[PDB]
Design a protein around this ligand. Structure first.
Ligand code: NA
Lengths: 107, 107
């Protein structure tokens, strides 16, 4: 059913500029949350790359410093990732609600 | 419009370094904007292809992840087409004002 997928997708995309109020909200919350996730990813990239290059210049405590510090950033990034997945599923019901009504009014 | 603008560029054919700064800026922005506009429309076609071809096997959370990217790109084209209209309007109204000084002077 690629026909219906496409048809519904199109009809949806012509409705973006006035979605339901709670749906815009959810998309905005997901955007802000995606930012927190993108930033923590770029942050982890540094701590990783920095640790790799400057690896030999480190004692046993200075190694256990960076790892236990990176563990904190990975754990934090995961909270965001897990939250997004929940906020996404919640939003999917709203999108399915909207497309059904949208396409009922177009029939 | 275009014809006026074509004749304006024909006047400076050799001496394009004489051509006003506000106008030389705008003529580039129009060319840059057209690339960014033409890229986003292509990106949307690919993203929509991915979505049509794999929606059946995608979980609700993943269906929303895809929909985020397509929405945002679709918003960006809408934005880039409003930008192109208003930039060409401003560029054309500038060219007209510059034509009135050169060719259509009141003396
Ligand atoms: Na006069």
């Amino acid at each position: 059913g690629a026909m219906a997928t496409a048809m519904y997708l199109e009809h949806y995309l012509d409705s973006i500029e006035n979605l339901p109020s709670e749906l815009q909200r959810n998309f905005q919350l997901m955007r802000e949350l995606d930012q927190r996730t993108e930033d923590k990813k770029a942050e982890i990239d540094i701590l990783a790359a920095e640790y790799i290059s400057t690896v030999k210049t480190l004692s046993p405590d200075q190694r256990v410093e960076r790892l236990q510090k990176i563990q904190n950033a990975y754990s934090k990034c995961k909270e965001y990732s897990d939250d997004k997945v929940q906020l996404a599923m919640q939003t999917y019901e709203m999108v399915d609600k909207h497309i059904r009504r949208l396409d009922a009014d177009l029939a």
